[PDB]
C-alpha cells in the first residue's frame with residue numbers, strides 16, 4: 079500500500095557523464111552534482127544552488143548560457159530498500175521532454191517510451207532492485223515546446239533558459255505484493271433534485287507475480303462498505319466494477335458561496351491470501367456539471383442545475399515550474415478575494431494538490447491543452463508547432479488518458495478544452511474522446527477556446543476575438559461588432575493589455591534606468607512584458623494613458639495614472655459581462671481575464687503580480703465582482719445592480735450622485751425598494767440623464783444600501799464629458815484603435831483632501847492576524863478623499879504579502895468613515911509589528927501603526 083515520493087535529486091549535465099550505465103550503480107561519485115528538491119526543472123535546481131542571479135530582476139535571465147540546455151541532464155538519487163519481499167515500482171509523470179530510466183545499472187525504459195510531460199508511467203523494477211542502497215537515475219532530454227508534447231510559454235513572458243527541461247511532478251516509489259492496485263475512482267450521478275446519488279466504484283488490479291491468484295478488493299466509499307473478489311492469471315490486469323451504491327442526501331459539492339465543498343473518501347485494499355497487497359486512498363465530489371450551447375450559440379455552464387456566468391482569469395504556474403503548496407493555495411484564495419469563480423488553465427496543468435485546493439475552496443477550474451506549439455502543430459498552419467508524425471499520436475492519446483485519470487474525481491474541474499486556438503482534426507479528436515471514455519472522464523469537452531469547431535464535438539460556443547492590448551472601457555459594452563471582444567458569447571481569454579504593478583514590485587523587478595525608460599518612452603521594448611514583437615512594448619497603453627489622463631510628469635505620475643487606468647478598464651471589462659449575462663439575445667456567458675497572474679515579474683496580463691501584491695487592476699476586478707454590486711454602464715449611463723449570491727434580494731436602495739471636481743453635487747437620484755434575483759441577475763436603478771454644467775472630468779458615486787440601511791456596495795467612477803469612441807474599421811486582431819479619447823486629465827488638478835486613519839491588529843489562534851483600519855475623510859471642505867489605498871506593511875515600510883482585504887482603494891466624502899479588514903499569516907510579518915501605509919490620489923501618504 080506504500081507510495082513514497084522521492085524527496086530530491088542530484089543533477090548534472092550529461093556533458094559530464096561518458097558512461098550512462100554508471101550513473102545508476104550504487105556508489106557512483108557525484109562530486110559537483112547539484113542537489114535539487116522534487117519537482118525541479120534544471121534551471122530551478124541551479125537557481126536553488128545560487129548558480130545564477132534572480133531572473134525576476136532586470137535582464138538577469140538573459141545572462142544564463144542556454145547552450146548547456148541542449149543536451150541531456152541527469153537526475154539521480156539513492157533509494158534504501160530494507161527488503162525485497164514486496165515488489166517495487168516507479169510511478170511518475172511530469173518529465174520534460176522525455177527520459178531514459180536506469181535502476182542499478184540496468185536501463186529499464188527509454189525516451190521512446192517515457193515521452194511527453196503528461197504521460198504517466200508505472201515501471202515494475204522488481205527485477206533490478208536489491209536490499210540495502212539502490213540507485214535510480216533519469217537521463218532527461220532537452221525540451222522544445224514546438225517539437226515535444228510538453229509545455230511552452232507562448233508569448234506570456236520570456237523563454238526560460240532550460241525550457242523547463244526536467245521532472246516537475248513527484249516520482250513515487252511504490253511497494254506491494256503480487257497485486258498492484260491502480261486507477262481507483264468513483265463514477266457519481268446525482269438526481270436532478272440533488273438529494274440522491276448513485277456511485278460506481280471502479281479500480282484496476284494487476285497481478286505481477288508469476289503465479290495465478292485470487293484477490294479481494296475491499297474498503298469504504300462515502301462511509302459504505304464494499305468488497306469484490308476476482309481471479310487474476312499471472313501478468314493479468316482487470317478492472318473491477320463494484321455493484322452500484324446508493325447515497326441518500328449527499329453532501330453536494332458547490333462552487334464557493336453556493337454551499338459547502340465537501341469531498342467524500344474512497345479507501346481501498348487489494349488483499350492476496352488474506353493479506354494486504356496494495357492500497358489506495360482518494361477523494362471525490364458529488365456534483366453535476368453541464369456546458370451546453372444556448373439558442374444564441376454561446377457556451378453555457380451550469381453546476382448542480384444552476385446556470386453560472388463564468389467569471390475568472392487565465393492561470394499560469396511559475397515560469398520555471400517551481401512548486402510550493404502554500405503558494406498555490408494562496409494564489410487560489412486570491413481568486414475568491416477577487417470575487418471570481420473560475421480559473422482557466424491553458425496547458426501547464428498543475429500537480430494534483432492544486433486541484434485538491436481548488437476543490438476545497440470551491441474555485442472552478444477549466445484545464446486544457448495550450449495553443450501555439452506542438453499540441454496544435456498538425457492543425458495550426460504557419461503558427462509555431464511542428465506537424466505530427468506517427469509516433470506523436472500515441473503520446474498525445476496517452477497524455478489525455480493520464481490527465482483524464484488525474485482529473486475525473488476533482489469536483490472543481492468543469493470541462494476539458496481539447497483545443498485552444500485551433501480545434502483538433504478528426505483523428506486527433508477521436509484519440510482524445512477515446513482516451514477520456516477509457517478513463518470515465520465524463521465532463522464537458524470544449525473543442526476550442528476560439529470560435530473554431532471540431533468535426534465530432536462540434537461548435538465551441540466560445541470566442542477569441544481579442545483584445546489583448548489597450549481598448550477604452552466603453553469597448554467592453556459593444557455588441558455590434560461580431561469579430562470583436564464585447565460582452566457577448568463566452569470570452570475565453572481577453573484583456574486591455576498592460577498592467578503596471580505596484581511601485582514596490584516595480585522596484586524589485588526593474589532597474590532605475592529601465593523604470594526611467596518605461597514612463598519616458600513607452601514605445602521601447604520591455605524585457606518584462608513579452609518575447610513577442612506584437613506585445614514587446616507599452617506603446618498603445620502609453621499613448622492612451624497620455625491622451626486620456628494627461629502626459630506623465632515623472633515615474634510616480636505614470637504609475638499613479640496606470641493604476642487608475644487599470645482599475646477603470648478591468649472594472650468595465652467584468653461589469654459589462656455581468657450586465658449582459660441576462661440579455662435575451664446574445665448574452666455573455668463567460669469571461670476569462672487574460673490573465674489572473676503572470677509566470678514571473680511582469681508588466682502585462684495580470685491581476686495580482688509575481689509577489690502577490692495588489693494594484694489597480696487587482697482592485698478593479700475585485701470591485702466589479704462584489705457579491706452585491708452597484709455599477710455604471712459606460713455605454714448608456716444605466717446604473718445596474720448585480721446580485722452574485724445564491725438568493726434573491728429585496729428592499730435595496732440604489733443612490734447615484736454626480737460631483738464636479740470642485741465637489742459640487744450636480745445630480746442626485748435615489749431608487750428605493752429594488753429586488754434582484756440570484757446568481758448574476760440584475761436590476762436597473764436609473765439611467766443618468768445628460769446633466770448640464772459638469773466639469774470636463776467629473777465623478778459618479780454609486781452606493782447600494784440593503785433594507786437594514788447597511789451600505790453593501792460603493793462604486794466611484796471618474797467620468798468625462800468627452801467620449802471614448804472606437805475606429806472599428808481600423809481594428810487588427812489584438813486591439814481596436816480609438817477615433818476619439820475621453821478627457822480624464824481633470825484629476826491632475828483635483829484639490830487636496832485628507833484622512834483620517836486608525837489601525838489595530840488581532841493575532842488569532844489559527845496563525846492569522848487581522849488588522850482593522852478605520853478611515854475618515856477629515857477634510858473641512860467639500861472635496862472627496864479619492865482612491866485611498868491601504869497597505870499592511872512592516873517596520874521598514876515593506877508590504878506584507880499575501881494579503882486579503884474585504885475592500886480597498888476607497889473614496890470617502892467629507893465626514894464619511896469606512897472600516898477595512900486585512901487578513902494575513904502572522905508569520906509573514908517575520909517578527910515586525912504591523913503598520914498600515916495609506917496613499918490617496920489627492921491625500922498624500924502617511925503610515926500609521928497597527
Ligand SMILES: NC[C@@H]1[C@@H](O)[C@H](O)[C@H]2[C@@H](O)CCN21
Pocket residue numbers: 232233234424449498499546571
Ligand atoms: N491561446 C490564445 C493565445 C494566448 O495563449 C496568447 O497569449 C494570446 C495572444 O497571443 C493572442 C492569442 N492568444
